UniProtKB/TrEMBL annotation, chain A:
Protein name per its UniProtKB record: Ferredoxin--NADP reductase
Cofactor: FAD
PANTHER family registered for this protein in UniProt: THIOREDOXIN REDUCTASE 1-RELATED-RELATED
Family note: Belongs to the ferredoxin--NADP reductase type 2 family.
One Gene Ontology term from the biological process aspect of the record: cell redox homeostasis
UniProt entry keywords in alphabetical sequence: FAD, Flavoprotein, NADP, Nucleotide-binding, Oxidoreductase
Cofactor remark from the record: Binds 1 FAD per subunit.
Pfam families, per database record: Pyr_redox_2 (PF07992)
Catalysed reaction equations from the record: 2 reduced [2Fe-2S]-[ferredoxin] + NADP(+) + H(+) = 2 oxidized [2Fe-2S]-[ferredoxin] + NADPH
Alphabetized InterPro entries for the sequence: FAD/NAD-bd_sf (IPR036188), FAD/NAD-binding_dom (IPR023753), Fd--NADP_Rdtase_type_2 (IPR022890), Ferredoxin-NADP_redctase_2 (IPR050097)
Record-listed FAD binding positions: A13, E32, K40, Y44, D51, V84, L119, D286, I297, S326, S327
Organism of this sequence: Bacillus cereus (strain ATCC 14579 / DSM 31 / CCUG 7414 / JCM 2152 / NBRC 15305 / NCIMB 9373 / NCTC 2599 / NRRL B-3711)
Enzyme superclass (EC): oxidoreductase
EC number, as in UniProt: 1.18.1.2
Amino acid sequence: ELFDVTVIGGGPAGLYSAFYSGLREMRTKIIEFHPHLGGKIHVYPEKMIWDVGGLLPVTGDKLIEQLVQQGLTFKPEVVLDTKVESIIRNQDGTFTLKTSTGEEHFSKTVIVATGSGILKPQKLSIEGAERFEVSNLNYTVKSLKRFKGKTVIISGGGNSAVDWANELEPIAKKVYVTYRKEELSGHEAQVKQLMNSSAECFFNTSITKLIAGDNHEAIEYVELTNHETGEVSHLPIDEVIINHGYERDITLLENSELDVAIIDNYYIAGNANSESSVDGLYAAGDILKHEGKLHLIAGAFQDAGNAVNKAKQFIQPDASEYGMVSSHNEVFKKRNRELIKQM
Amino acid sequence: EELFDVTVIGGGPAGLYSAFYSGLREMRTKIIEFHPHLGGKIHVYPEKMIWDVGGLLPVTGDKLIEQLVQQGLTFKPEVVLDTKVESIIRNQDGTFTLKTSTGEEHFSKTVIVATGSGILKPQKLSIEGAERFEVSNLNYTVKSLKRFKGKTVIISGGGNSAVDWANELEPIAKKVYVTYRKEELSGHEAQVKQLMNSSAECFFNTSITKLIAGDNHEAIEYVELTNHETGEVSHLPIDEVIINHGYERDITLLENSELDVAIIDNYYIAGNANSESSVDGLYAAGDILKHEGKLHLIAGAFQDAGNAVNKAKQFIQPDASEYGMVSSHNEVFKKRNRELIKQMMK
Ligand SMILES: Cc1cc2nc3c(=O)[nH]c(=O)nc-3n(C[C@H](O)[C@H](O)[C@H](O)COP(=O)(O)OP(=O)(O)OC[C@H]3O[C@@H](n4cnc5c(N)ncnc54)[C@H](O)[C@@H]3O)c2cc1C
Ligand SMILES: Cc1cc2nc3c(=O)[nH]c(=O)nc-3n(C[C@H](O)[C@H](O)[C@H](O)COP(=O)(O)OP(=O)(O)OC[C@H]3O[C@@H](n4cnc5c(N)ncnc54)[C@H](O)[C@@H]3O)c2cc1C
């Protein structure tokens, strides 16, 4: 089970890597920590994205869909819910990847596309809270439309919370914010927009229980307790959003034995073709640093394409330097046939 | 003055995204293109399906052009069409003057060269007054496959491109004729074998010698064929005529310029990984840019363009940030987004 190309990470860079790897006819695997492909766009799926080349403005949610679909065009082996723990370069020059459960994967080449690492939202510490993640307890704003005309309480006071409140005020029926401190630890320019308009803020307050109402499995009321007086208010709500920050895991390369050059203790020091200091090991997306790195989704595509063209030649030296342009690539002939049936 | 921040030469993918991103970073932006339509080399393949633009599900070149043009015009740059830029002059203060073929002049703090492989023009039919029918059914590209559904088309020429057109139209058209001036179908001897096992009928040592219009409409109804080795003069009823005799190419822009601009292999601008040329304030993006990490795709044009724009902004405003603000949080979209979000809420 030795793969041609194994992509670590399922964001824009990893997904396009898998795509272009399949366009160049390589046995391809993609390994992602979360149960869902898409990467960091999951942090802002409600926002409008204008700066992807060739795309008219689209929401994060819709962009994730289009990238996942393109990334799976050639049916790579998809390994979700898996944290890659370490990368080993074997003596024969192939690579072995160890997962958190000790399972192992083997590859001729590895494309590191871990972006800024593993992100996990800090969870609400109340007993049966995770029961409501399947209904109306959220850790992101999945879409603005989800909250049209609904009553929403945001727990937390970061810049993310102030941002969420400000975009939801025009849309929700009502917006509540509860912060456990006495001052909104946000930016003192967008904090006043929040305060001159519709949002109602509670300070030194937190959520202490989630009431599901008689017959349903979704939150209807929220118990609020004040930390300076002591009141135990109750509040009817349609939606709850927790913004208590994020937990980060960047240990992948520290846990590995590879003389891979690192910039600023995190980023892979690459060149303009996405090569690292280790043969057959490439870097694409936010994990990649070089003088020409473009810190946009559009840059991730360039990083990925360069990585794959190099991987192809590493594996097959007589391969051409570049992939066949898709309009004339025979690899799409069968698929194009079905689509052409559009008359 | 009429002094622009960024003037883009070339309206293809690289130029259009440059214009967009230049607007994203709040610079006075102008874009100059030779043809009457923006879009670049994609007008050579508008019927093909394009799969490898990042984030894009397969779409025809026709639709991609539409999408690229709308994005490139987001911030309403000054668009100068039907205009050939003849030379680039670096003025004594380090600004630039661009001279068009009619002598007009444009001025800019920075210049982004996005001319691809240059100005491309189809080789026209050497027949009197043929241009009359360009408005009707005399085509120099396959603008779409559906345009030829169940129709009768003759293709003149026999190169790899002519063989490719016939091959994609044979399953779609009622009937495909190919007429070639040579003895052999001088394409590539692989897909040439697909053409002659299929329903496409070839006429060798033949060329089109006159076009015959209909009487009650002014398309072409009959084509006069002349076999050049016998002498026969056939006539042939058709719905569509497609010419493919090659292209004319105009690459003189940089030869005609007095710029100390390093050139690779007599054509490409020798850039670095940030799309900089050897001349301060002159950038290159797209197929015209060569450096060790240049990606020869539409996807690569976008990175060349963003990198070029970020550099132009710092050249013009040294304290500007090295990076543009991501669109999702960039205040320059706020009023536009408000209108979009309103539509989204039913
Ligand atoms: C708020 C915000 C807004 C942005 N907006 C824009 C915008 O409008 N336009 C734009 O062009 N760019 C934008 N970006 C820039 C950024 O490039 C993209 O957001 C994108 O996420 C980068 O893609 P990437 O694949 O390289 O990294 P990521 O998207 O971070 O993908 C990395 C993936 O790898 C996984 N992973 C990491 N480590 C491991 C491991 N050890 N094992 C398994 N899986 C692992 C992670 O779970 C994640 O899914 C924005 C960034 C932010 C933070
Ligand atoms: C047949 C074919 C298929 C392709 N398929 C794909 C594909 O499927 N996917 C992919 O990613 N890439 C593909 N490409 C690759 C190529 O990058 C794109 O086609 C694209 O055209 C390059 O963008 P560009 O803006 O830099 O240059 P161009 O598209 O060539 O645009 C340059 C523009 O500048 C104008 N111009 C030039 N000189 C002047 C001047 N002096 N004054 C004024 N205007 C001027 C020209 O008129 C033209 O409009 C393909 C290329 C070809 C030939």
